[PDB]
Write a protein that binds this ligand. Structure first.
Ligand SMILES: [Mn+2]
Ligand SMILES: [Mn+2]
Ligand SMILES: [Mn+2]
Ligand SMILES: [Mn+2]
Lengths: 241, 246
């Protein structure tokens, strides 16, 4: 009994892992989201020239995108904004208040307008919600409401992947079908990661797709724990809900 | 069997402001950030890349700056409005050497190494980078380097946003090379200082003997006005398209 999404197609378009041959791996994250109600870009990687190149090689039509959502102000997620907005300025933007006011001003003058998200969760597009800005760095994740459950996407997940999972489940009172993105576990030891995994098991996370800054150790442990419920990420990966 | 040596000081230096939130010439899009195209006797380099690499390349075309004659790219510090144009510059002209502060992400340094002629990572010690061109070394909490150009008229010190304090960057430069400062230019980060401390900054720069200033970018209109009242013609107008000849 929800106003959920019919089909959701997520394409990783920038990553430091490669799911497909023919793509330059670089540090950063970005993914292209197509639903039956909206189309949007989530983050822009560290390099907008490679990002545009990746999208041409993936047959991603950037001009079909209605909105650009930014997770947090780090170089490896806003590094492609200028290249994206040059070719497709007619977009509404959704950014966290952690972003420089100078940048927010420049973006407003270039696009259909910038919505600034605060600590309060908020719907952005049909079936697409922001967690609100969390953590000291000031990061927002996006929650997509689908028939199979929630799909949560994070940039580097600085506030803690388990706090973002729990925030999303509170917002919409549905379980999480897919938790994906960068988890920022690359500097953590084995013990800590097993605690995170088992908290994600308590919350009932059904599938995960850790990539970007998640860490080789964490990704391996996630794989051995979730098995086939742990999806291979990287540039060119396509996930359909 | 003939020997060849670089000059210690450059006889002529030409500095072109190619990205700024002030405009000196008509018909350029101001945006928050800074970039400088520097031509010396023996080398040509970029100092920072603004916040928007597409606008940066457009500004450089309109200014008849050929990016491809630049031998090096120097980054002052990791803020979005100074590294925002790096990817656009390296796509058209990757055959450059890079000089970056150690406050840059090691992930970003790794990526820049694979795409360029190589990255030199500056630490806390001052360091020569090019003929007549030195870095102060990484200063401040954010980790910002400024460049000191050795000229036959004295030192030309260029700064991105000057987070460590413009008076400390001035003093460091003078310690480095034991020459007076002919020109101190760039963003001085004096935007939210009251007139009382802008005044003690100004007279510290007077005691250091700064001969000319060009505050721009994040300097602040309050400070810029006090600077232009104190220095008169020795305070130069900044902005896109401003060409300073030494
Ligand atoms: Mn991050
Ligand atoms: Mn990241
Ligand atoms: Mn700065
Ligand atoms: Mn700045």
């Amino acid at each position: 009994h929800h106003m959920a999404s019919n089909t959701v197609k997520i394409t990783i378009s920038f990553d430091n892992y490669a799911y497909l041959e023919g793509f330059q791996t670089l540090w950063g994250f970005s993914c292209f989201v197509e639903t039956d109600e909206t189309t949007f870009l989530f983050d822009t990687g560290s390099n907008g020239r490679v990002l545009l190149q990746n999208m041409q090689q993936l047959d991603i039509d950037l001009k079909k995108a209605e909105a650009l959502i930014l997770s947090h102000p780090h170089w490896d997620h806003i590094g492609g904004v200028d290249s994206v907005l040059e070719v497709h300025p007619q977009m509404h933007l959704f950014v966290p208040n952690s972003l420089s006011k100078h940048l927010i001003r420049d973006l407003n003058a270039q696009t259909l307008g910038v919505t600034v998200i605060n600590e309060s969760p908020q719907q952005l597009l049909p079936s697409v919600y922001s967690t609100g800005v969390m953590g000291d760095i000031g990061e927002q994740s996006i929650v997509i409401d689908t028939e199979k459950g929630l799909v949560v996407i994070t940039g580097c997940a600085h506030p803690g992947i388990e706090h973002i999972a729990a925030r999303s489940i509170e917002m919409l009172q549905k379980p999480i079908y897919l938790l994906m993105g960068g988890f920022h576990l690359m500097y953590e030891n084995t013990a800590r990661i097993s605690e995170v995994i088992e908290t994600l098991d308590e919350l009932g996370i059904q599938n995960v797709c850790p990539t970007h800054c998640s860490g080789d150790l964490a990704i391996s442990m996630f794989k051995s724990h979730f098995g086939d419920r742990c999806l291979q990420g990287g540039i060119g990966r396509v996930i359909t809900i």
